[PDB]
Design a protein around this ligand. Structure first.
Ligand SMILES: *[C@@H]1O[C@H](CO[C@@H]2O[C@@H](C)[C@@H](O)[C@@H](O)[C@@H]2O)[C@@H](O[C@@H]2O[C@H](CO)[C@@H](O)[C@H](O)[C@H]2NC(C)=O)[C@H](O)[C@H]1NC(C)=O
Ligand SMILES: *[C@@H]1O[C@H](CO)[C@@H](O)[C@H](O)[C@H]1NC(C)=O
Length: 237
């Protein structure tokens, strides 16, 4: 019931990263990521791409409005007084602890990098986030818990075969991870708001192990290479 949801909203700790990039020539981008992972919501230069297990983000939701305001702010900075730069980016990296928030705020231009660390909003930018912590946590908690579980080793799919050895690792989480062969390699990182597909191929390789290392704090192995492309899960090693 509502009572228990409230307590869980408070107790669950996580981070959200809001980022906006504005470039001279009309190319902008707004994104939301959680737990310092890949973006789960992307607005490209329309409607955003929103991860399937993400809450809906309408034009009036706090997340959308925060990013919209930052975008307008950055446009102003370019037009007003930043001609020594072709682009500007702002990033709010916020920790939601209880109903408190600590954000590190980063601004980047061609020649200048700025960081305001440890902002609590108690500077205006963080204030808006701080003032809406309960709503944000309530909206995102379930999404963030699922994203962690989807990052588990046993939710990770691995196609490790030989034709020329290839290892394709698929994850439905935004949690970062790396894929390494037991070896000259080619590494491909394809990602959408919904999944990550990391492929490592080494031509003329007879590597017998494909390792998967997760930011979540785990490492697993798939071995030996198949002759066919079939999905398996990494084994703790
Ligand atoms: C899937 O695996 C998890 C445990 O996976 C490990 O721990 C994760 C935190 C992550 O680091 C993974 O990559 C690791 O491989 C299972 O969850 C555990 O289940 C046991 C008993 O079943 C329980 O005592 C633990 O508390 C659980 N771990 C936690 C804290 O989540 C989960 O059951 C597995 N799911 C399936 C389908 O088997
Ligand atoms: C396997 O080799 C064949 C040609 O012999 C090629 O068409 C195919 O793309 C290869 N598959 C992989 C996994 O590289």
């Amino acid at each position: 019931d509502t009572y228990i949801v409230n307590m869980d909203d408070f107790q669950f700790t996580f981070t959200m990263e809001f980022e906006v990039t504005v470039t001279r020539g009309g190319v902008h981008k707004r994104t939301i990521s959680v737990d310092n992972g890949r973006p789960v919501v992307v607005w490209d230069v329309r409607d955003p791409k929103i991860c399937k297990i993400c809450p809906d983000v309408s034009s009036t939701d706090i997340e959308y409005v925060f990013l919209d305001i930052q975008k307008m702010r950055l446009n102003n900075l370019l037009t007003q007084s930043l001609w020594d730069t072709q682009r500007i980016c702002v990033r709010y990296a916020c920790l939601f602890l209880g109903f408190d928030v600590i954000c590190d705020v980063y601004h980047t231009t061609d020649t200048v990098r700025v960081a305001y660390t440890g902002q609590t909003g108690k500077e205006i930018g963080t204030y808006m986030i701080k003032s809406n912590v309960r709503e944000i946590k309530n909206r995102w908690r379930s999404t963030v818990q699922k994203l962690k579980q989807l990052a588990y080793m046993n939710a990770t799919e691995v196609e490790f075969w030989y034709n020329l050895t290839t290892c394709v690792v698929t994850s439905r989480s935004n949690v970062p991870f790396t894929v390494e062969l037991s070896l000259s390699a080619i590494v491909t990182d394809e990602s959408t708001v919904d999944c990550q597909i990391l492929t490592v191929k080494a031509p003329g390789s007879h590597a017998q192990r494909c390792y998967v290392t997760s930011s979540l704090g785990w490492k697993g192995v798939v071995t030996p290479p198949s002759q066919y492309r079939t999905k398996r899960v990494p084994v703790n090693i």
